[PDB]
Amino acid sequence: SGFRKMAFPSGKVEGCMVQVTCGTTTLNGLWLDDVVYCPRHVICTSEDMLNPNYEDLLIRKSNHNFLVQAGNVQLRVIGHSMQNCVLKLKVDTANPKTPKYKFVRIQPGQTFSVLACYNGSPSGVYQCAMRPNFTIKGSFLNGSCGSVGFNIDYDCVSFCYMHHMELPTGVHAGTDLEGNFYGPFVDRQTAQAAGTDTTITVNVLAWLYAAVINGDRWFLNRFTTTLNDFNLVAMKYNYEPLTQDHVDILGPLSAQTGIAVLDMCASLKELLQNGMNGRTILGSALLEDEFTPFDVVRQCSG
Amino acid sequence: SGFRKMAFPSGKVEGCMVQVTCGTTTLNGLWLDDVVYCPRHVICTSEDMLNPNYEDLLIRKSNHNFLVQAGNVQLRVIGHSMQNCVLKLKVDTANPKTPKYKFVRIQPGQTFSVLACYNGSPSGVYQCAMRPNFTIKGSFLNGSCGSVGFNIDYDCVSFCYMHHMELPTGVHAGTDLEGNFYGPFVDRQTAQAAGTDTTITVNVLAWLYAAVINGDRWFLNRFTTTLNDFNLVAMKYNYEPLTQDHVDILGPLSAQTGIAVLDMCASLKELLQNGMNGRTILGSALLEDEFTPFDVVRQCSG
Ligand SMILES: CN(C)CCNC(=O)C[C@H](Cc1ccc(F)cc1)NC(=O)[C@@H](Cc1ccc(Cl)cc1Cl)NC(=O)[C@H](N)Cc1ccccc1C#N
Ligand SMILES: CN(C)CCNC(=O)C[C@H](Cc1ccc(F)cc1)NC(=O)[C@@H](Cc1ccc(Cl)cc1Cl)NC(=O)[C@H](N)Cc1ccccc1C#N
Ligand code: NA
């Protein structure tokens, strides 16, 4: 028992992290087969970053402008090309530790693990949720660009995020591994802002179920509510509306605990209206929304 | 920027996890050089677990009673021996992925990463603190015994914890890699209890400093306090007393922010007496005490 924010084991991804240097800029790349993926702004200088035209900047580059280091061993670039906001560097060696992998794009509300890296060297691992405004609340210092986010499914790594930038408010923005940004952001050094955020309602319920499975029951009640009467309370507290599809995903957790989804909605209605009265749920005094139904199942009986 | 609970990259440890089977019991072992380490209760049956004598039980065993599996590849046991509460199995192969490592015992209040494993296969990574009562609040299901906790220092893995058991209250107890329990627990299936817990004061202050470094300042004040006048407030709220040695460890964080330790103590005095008034610090509505000064430095400028 116990419920903690858990990351995927990072070893399969650690063997893919390299350091890409161009000019005086150095960041991280992802080495799969004979291709290194990294943020395209690595080709920018300090002055180009204000209003770059990346088509221009790449055309003015050649293979010898990019220094690739897999540990102490320098790799040889034999080709380059741009794929939206990521640069692809072809090298003369297939990474012999290349795992089975996929490039997948995730949905707001879904989670992944981040392997934070500096100069091609992994320094830490943690879990993130894609917020409804397509930012993540991560932990990234200068030089962490190119760090990747990923899920793991039976020794297949699904890469879903590459880190590009920090916004003025301290939240983080990146692309999928095809170079397409999450959200309405561009890789240009101008102050952009995220849209307004909301709480992921289905994740909160999943977390309440996790709490019940772990012996926290103080917030339950005998009452029930209708799907429509709950969505009214959601809008008043800036929660996402609950769908009939969300209830079916919560089936396995409802099944295991005996608590119907709409009975747990009634408990959540009361926590929103009353607060917690000094008590905690799984060690938090706030309602947590960064656990998916899948994260709950995977940790509570998986 | 951003501050998250971060684990060490787990790859160096993933290549050391094996599955040890004896009788109908199967759990995880740690394979370093030609030795596999695992919890000794793997030699117990269901009836021996009530009041075992482990000297007796091991003497009645032989090398062919232990099945070791490093993936699909079965390893051959050529010797066995007991080291307090851990069993050591000698095998005919030195693990070729053995990292540079040390066996270290940690202190209450220090943190480490846990690689949770099931049947020799890593399933997740998270951070833990050793509580002052020598338990940890982890996430462990049946079969996770033998999972290890570890820190990393310049590609040297310091192993500090092996998981053995869950207590009635849901907290977890284990040994160091020399087989000596943390705290007053034994590896016998009887209901034991931990001593009473306390908040790690030096970790809370470290976390307040992390919050300042990340732009959270709402809890600061102009007031200051004396070391002795603060220790009085600590005892009233079940916090550990603050030493002169603790203040010097907080030097680097005090230096970086301009806020003296005893000025931050005055801020903590007020949060304890008043609470948070509905506000949060680094995404929490509670005072967090599972970050060391080292974890803060390592993430906020390291
Ligand atoms: C102090 N604290 C409370 C919060 C303060 N918050 C900030 O200081 C972040 C800061 C906010 C900002 C200010 C003005 C702008 F006009 C745009 C953004 N943002 C930047 O410095 C960006 C600039 C950038 C550069 C390149 C592109 Cl394509 C796109 C961009 Cl917007 N730099 C990165 O993001 C680097 N790549 C990696 C990096 C560098 C420094 C710090 C963090 C990170 C990360 N991760
Ligand atoms: C439901 N929820 C709200 C909280 C309920 N809490 C409990 O159910 C844990 C439960 C609490 C307990 C009850 C009676 C006792 F008398 C001693 C302990 N404890 C055990 O089942 C222990 C027993 C054990 C076995 C061997 C030794 Cl050496 C030492 C020990 Cl005390 N089993 C393990 O710890 C296994 N090794 C691994 C394991 C099995 C099942 C569940 C978790 C874990 C873990 N991790
Ligand atoms: Na984590």
Side-chain angles (χ1 to χ4, degrees):
Chain A
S1 89
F3 196 78
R4 278 221 158 216
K5 205 174 291 168
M6 200 175 303
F8 287 107
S10 67
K12 279 126 300 187
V13 182
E14 293 170 60
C16 298
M17 300 305 302
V18 300
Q19 165 179 21
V20 181
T21 305
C22 177
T24 51
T25 299
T26 173
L27 43 64
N28 307 296
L30 183 69
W31 182 28
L32 308 164
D33 303 309
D34 55 290
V35 177
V36 170
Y37 301 85
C38 70
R40 68 167 170 190
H41 69 254
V42 76
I43 68 184
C44 288
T45 61
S46 303
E47 175 178 315
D48 292 295
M49 272 308 315
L50 192 269
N51 194 29
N53 183 274
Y54 286 103
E55 194 144 328
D56 278 354
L57 296 176
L58 180 61
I59 257 278
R60 309 171 171 164
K61 243 68 192 184
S62 24
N63 294 341
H64 54 95
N65 296 121
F66 305 94
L67 296 313
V68 177
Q69 297 176 230
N72 42 274
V73 174
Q74 188 210 19
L75 292 180
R76 173 168 143 77
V77 186
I78 68 175
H80 57 282
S81 75
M82 197 161 288
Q83 163 123 40
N84 304 124
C85 298
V86 303
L87 173 87
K88 299 165 62 196
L89 302 176
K90 195 161 179 172
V91 298
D92 62 354
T93 315
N95 179 6
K97 291 168 309 309
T98 297
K100 242 291 299 162
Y101 71 88
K102 287 188 273 282
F103 291 165
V104 319
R105 186 175 175 95
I106 54 152
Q107 291 290 336
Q110 289 175 330
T111 51
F112 54 100
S113 306
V114 173
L115 177 67
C117 300
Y118 295 93
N119 307 290
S121 282
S123 103
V125 194
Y126 54 91
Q127 279 268 117
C128 274
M130 181 66 65
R131 311 297 315 165
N133 62 7
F134 297 102
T135 66
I136 68 189
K137 287 159 174 179
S139 170
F140 290 115
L141 305 180
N142 191 36
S144 64
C145 328
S147 295
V148 299
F150 64 93
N151 285 288
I152 300 189
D153 166 54
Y154 297 116
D155 219 357
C156 173
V157 184
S158 283
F159 291 105
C160 61
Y161 174 89
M162 176 166 266
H163 181 57
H164 286 248
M165 64 194 211
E166 185 172 315
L167 298 189
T169 59
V171 304
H172 298 98
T175 67
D176 59 34
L177 269 292
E178 240 79 48
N180 305 119
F181 262 95
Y182 286 101
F185 314 108
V186 299
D187 51 339
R188 152 145 116 267
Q189 216 220 114
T190 61
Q192 26 207 326
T196 35
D197 215 14
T198 61
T199 295
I200 315 148
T201 311
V202 69
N203 284 5
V204 172
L205 292 165
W207 176 76
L208 292 182
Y209 277 115
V212 175
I213 297 175
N214 279 272
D216 262 321
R217 303 178 66 96
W218 62 260
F219 51 81
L220 298 169
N221 55 35
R222 70 191 194 275
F223 303 106
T224 184
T225 185
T226 92
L227 191 35
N228 288 332
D229 291 76
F230 177 74
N231 287 319
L232 265 307
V233 184
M235 297 262 77
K236 184 173 133 64
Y237 293 94
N238 190 32
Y239 272 55
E240 294 205 81
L242 194 67
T243 76
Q244 188 57 36
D245 172 58
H246 287 148
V247 177
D248 315 323
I249 305 161
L250 295 174
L253 295 172
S254 208
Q256 182 184 349
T257 62
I259 298 174
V261 171
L262 293 79
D263 181 6
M264 192 71 92
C265 286
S267 295
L268 171 59
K269 181 183 306 169
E270 249 51 79
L271 292 168
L272 284 177
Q273 295 177 351
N274 295 312
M276 295 202 169
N277 300 83
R279 284 162 303 179
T280 69
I281 304 182
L282 293 172
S284 174
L286 299 174
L287 303 171
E288 303 284 340
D289 83 335
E290 304 236 321
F291 300 96
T292 63
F294 172 88
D295 298 314
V296 181
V297 164
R298 152 164 128 81
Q299 195 167 155
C300 283
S301 265
Chain B
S1 89
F3 196 78
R4 278 221 158 216
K5 205 174 291 168
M6 200 175 303
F8 287 107
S10 67
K12 279 126 300 187
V13 182
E14 293 170 60
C16 298
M17 300 305 302
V18 300
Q19 165 179 21
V20 181
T21 305
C22 177
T24 51
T25 299
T26 173
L27 43 64
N28 307 296
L30 183 69
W31 182 28
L32 308 164
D33 303 309
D34 55 290
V35 177
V36 170
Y37 301 85
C38 70
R40 68 167 170 190
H41 69 254
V42 76
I43 68 184
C44 288
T45 61
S46 303
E47 175 178 315
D48 292 295
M49 272 308 315
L50 192 269
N51 194 29
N53 183 274
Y54 286 103
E55 194 144 328
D56 278 354
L57 296 176
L58 180 61
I59 257 278
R60 309 171 171 164
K61 243 68 192 184
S62 24
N63 294 341
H64 54 95
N65 296 121
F66 305 94
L67 296 313
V68 177
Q69 297 176 230
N72 42 274
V73 174
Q74 188 210 19
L75 292 180
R76 173 168 143 77
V77 186
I78 68 175
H80 57 282
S81 75
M82 197 161 288
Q83 163 123 40
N84 304 124
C85 298
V86 303
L87 173 87
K88 299 165 62 196
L89 302 176
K90 195 161 179 172
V91 298
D92 62 354
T93 315
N95 179 6
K97 291 168 309 309
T98 297
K100 242 291 299 162
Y101 71 88
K102 287 188 273 282
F103 291 165
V104 319
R105 186 175 175 95
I106 54 152
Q107 291 290 336
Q110 289 175 330
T111 51
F112 54 100
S113 306
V114 173
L115 177 67
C117 300
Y118 295 93
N119 307 290
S121 282
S123 103
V125 194
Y126 54 91
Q127 279 268 117
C128 274
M130 181 66 65
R131 311 297 315 165
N133 62 7
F134 297 102
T135 66
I136 68 189
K137 287 159 174 179
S139 170
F140 290 115
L141 305 180
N142 191 36
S144 64
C145 328
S147 295
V148 299
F150 64 93
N151 285 288
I152 300 189
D153 166 54
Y154 297 116
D155 219 357
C156 173
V157 184
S158 283
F159 291 105
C160 61
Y161 174 89
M162 176 166 266
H163 181 57
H164 286 248
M165 64 194 211
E166 185 172 315
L167 298 189
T169 59
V171 304
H172 298 98
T175 67
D176 59 34
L177 269 292
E178 240 79 48
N180 305 119
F181 262 95
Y182 286 101
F185 314 108
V186 299
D187 51 339
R188 152 145 116 267
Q189 216 220 114
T190 61
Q192 26 207 326
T196 35
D197 215 14
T198 61
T199 295
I200 315 148
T201 311
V202 69
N203 284 5
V204 172
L205 292 165
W207 176 76
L208 292 182
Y209 277 115
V212 175
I213 297 175
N214 279 272
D216 262 321
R217 303 178 66 96
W218 62 260
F219 51 81
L220 298 169
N221 55 35
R222 70 191 194 275
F223 303 106
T224 184
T225 185
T226 92
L227 191 35
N228 288 332
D229 291 76
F230 177 74
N231 287 319
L232 265 307
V233 184
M235 297 262 77
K236 184 173 133 64
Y237 293 94
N238 190 32
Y239 272 55
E240 294 205 81
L242 194 67
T243 76
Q244 188 57 36
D245 172 58
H246 287 148
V247 177
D248 315 323
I249 305 161
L250 295 174
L253 295 172
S254 208
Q256 182 184 349
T257 62
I259 298 174
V261 171
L262 293 79
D263 181 6
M264 192 71 92
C265 286
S267 295
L268 171 59
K269 181 183 306 169
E270 249 51 79
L271 292 168
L272 284 177
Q273 295 177 351
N274 295 312
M276 295 202 169
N277 300 83
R279 284 162 303 179
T280 69
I281 304 182
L282 293 172
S284 174
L286 299 174
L287 303 171
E288 303 284 340
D289 83 335
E290 304 236 321
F291 300 96
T292 63
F294 172 88
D295 298 314
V296 181
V297 164
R298 152 164 128 81
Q299 195 167 155
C300 283
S301 265

